[PDB]
Amino acid sequence: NTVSIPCHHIRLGDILLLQGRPCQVIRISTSAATGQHRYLGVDLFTKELREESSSISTPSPSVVVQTMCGPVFKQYRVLDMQAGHIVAMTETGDVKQNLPVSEQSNLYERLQRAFESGSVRALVVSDNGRELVCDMAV
Numbered sequence: 001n002t003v004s005i006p007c008h009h010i011r012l013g014d015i016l017l018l019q020g021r022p023c024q025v026i027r028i029s030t031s032a033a034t035g036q037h038r039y040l041g042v043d044l045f046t047k048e049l050r051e052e053s054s055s056i057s058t059p060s061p062s063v064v065v066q067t068m069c070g071p072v073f074k075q076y077r078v079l080d081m082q083a084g085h086i087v088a089m090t091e092t093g094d095v096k097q098n099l100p101v102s103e104q105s106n107l108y109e110r111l112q113r114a115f116e117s118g119s120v121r122a123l124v125v126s127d128n129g130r131e132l133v134c135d136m137a138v
Contacts, residue, residue, distance in 0.1 A: 001126070007037045007054050007066040015125065015134065016041060017069040018050040022125045022134070024104065037066060044102055044134055045127055075121040075137065081112055086133060088122050099124065102134040111136050 014025045023041030030037055036053040054066040076088035088096040101108040114120045123135035
């Protein structure tokens with residue numbers, strides 16, 4: 001349920017797990033004392049601000065790895081759209097009747113636009129069992 005992401009590949013707007021919750025990164029800084037990077041982000045589900053500092057590992061001599069964890073995004077087919085949510089289907093055919101859609105960057109209107117023109121995929125993040133369409137693909 002976690003993707004390891006090197007810090008040097010993390011940019012503003014990326015979605016990371018911060019304190020275990022999927023958050024859109026809004027500020028990146030570096031600790032003067034430790035060298036760790038600090039990520040400030042907005043919880044995609046609750047919109048609270050959360051921060052978390054990178055983990056530093058040294059697997060081999062002279063290799064210093066700083067990483068953060070990103071969520072695993074699932075790709076769901078979009079079968080219908082109604083009332084700000086979608087009806088989705090997983091790869092195996094499991095129907096999700098009532099998937100909410102992130103308010104980020106006019107996602108639902110863009111989804112609806114592409115839906116109206118079976119190429120759309122909803123990109124879904126999970127947190128504590130709750131699923132949220134947080135991006136789209138065609």
